[PDB]
Design a protein around this ligand. Structure first.
Ligand SMILES: CCCCCCSC[C@H](NC(=O)CC[C@H]([NH3+])C(=O)O)C(=O)NCC(=O)O
Ligand SMILES: CCCCCCSC[C@H](NC(=O)CC[C@H]([NH3+])C(=O)O)C(=O)NCC(=O)O
Lengths: 216, 218
């Protein structure tokens, strides 16, 4: 299973943690976006959206969007351990719906607002000071997550980390290395430190996040 | 099942089409965002993220994010018709993964880039011209969609529309009412007209998108 990735990339790290969780060994194919590797035909042919992470399975099926890959890894490759699949991706429609909402929250709100605030400062033009409005918006997302975590060990509830935790862990590790004071959000910090301690492959998460940290 | 919504809202319309597809009646509850109705304490208690659509089921279970609601509607309320659920949301992990990718594409790329380009023009400050970079990015998303649809009837493949078609249909109807010329993207236009002519709730989608046009009278 080929895995087109960068360690700094949060969505890549989310897949790496999920692959570790289900015992899938990824064949790592470092894909240098700064060089322009993702715009080479061999990547474009596989993925016309030219984005990482991209997974290519045993049969040549190509998949992207980290959170879609996460689900695929559990459904297909995690299936063999039924209690494991149920922990990572509970099948009850209500429980699963919360997992889904947290995944969409991560892509569309939590990580999105992180990117809109920080990317202008660290990429492209590299603006000295972040936008006050984009900052308030990002803080609102952290406040949402803090609220989700009130009286809850994990982001989507349950007694074990789900793929939503793994996704949001990749995101929040990126906040940390960006130098955002996560201790302002008590539930987020508590969840972050505890889940990082227990989730397999969280090492790669912190290590890769440190790579992203080099932009700051 | 209570449905906190506005007809103009694309994600609300995606839920409307999905509920129609699975034969679920929504108790419609207009929620005026400009009026701060989503910020009332009782609403925040149901949904601290204060966003629409919000669905409250028969047991008081509260759910938001339209695409999570779409999946929930199929699994809990559509699945009694096994064939119908399989069409809307195929269970084979490979086939389902493409459906999931398209749903995530819709929220994070297609609709997101629509919002980033048009919202500054229609909300708050109301800038007389859209940002060129944001326009290029939005066109790129339409280009991606057009490519997905090359030689295919539906967004995630298959012989029938899925929940991904319904979600992206709500988004593209919003492109249309914004005045974007979709004939620039032949596969998108072809798919849009065809799917609008066949799916349940397409009436709600077009009527609601027309309402969103209230922001684009200039
Ligand atoms: C090492 C730090 C560099 C910044 C890392 C950002 S992640 C790279 C980016 N990937 C994505 O935005 C994928 C997002 C998608 N929502 C997912 O979760 O997979 C990309 O391939 N962008 C290129 C493109 O889309 O063309
Ligand atoms: C402000 C209106 C913009 C025009 C209509 C956009 S849809 C309304 C908007 N809805 C959402 O943020 C939900 C998006 C979510 N991704 C989904 O698909 O459900 C909202 O409730 N926004 C208010 C909020 O989140 O506080």
């Amino acid at each position: 299973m080929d895995f087109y990735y960068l360690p700094g990339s949060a969505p890549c790290r989310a897949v790496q943690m999920t692959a570790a969780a289900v015992g899938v060994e990824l064949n790592l194919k470092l894909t240098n976006l700064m060089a322009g590797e993702h715009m080479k035909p061999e990547f474009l042919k596989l993925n016309p959206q030219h984005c990482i992470p991209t997974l290519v399975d045993e049969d040549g099926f190509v998949l992207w969007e980290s959170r879609a890959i996460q689900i695929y890894l559990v459904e297909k490759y995690g299936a063999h351990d039924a209690d494991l699949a149920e922990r990572l991706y509970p099948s009850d429609p209500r429980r699963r719906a919360v997992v889904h909402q947290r995944l969409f929250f991560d892509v569309a709100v939590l990580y999105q607002r992180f990117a809109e605030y920080y990317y202008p400062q660290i990429f492209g033009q590299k603006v000295p000071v972040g936008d006050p409005g984009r900052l308030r918006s990002m803080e609102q997302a952290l406040e949402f997550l803090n609220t989700f975590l009130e009286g809850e060990q994990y982001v989507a509830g349950g007694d074990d980390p789900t793929i939503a935790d793994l996704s949001i862990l990749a995101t929040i590790a990126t906040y940390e290395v960006a130098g955002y004071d996560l201790r302002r959000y008590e539930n987020v910090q508590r969840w972050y430190e505890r889940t990082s301690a227990i989730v397999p492959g969280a090492d790669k998460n912190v290590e890769g996040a440190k790579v992203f940290g080099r932009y700051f």
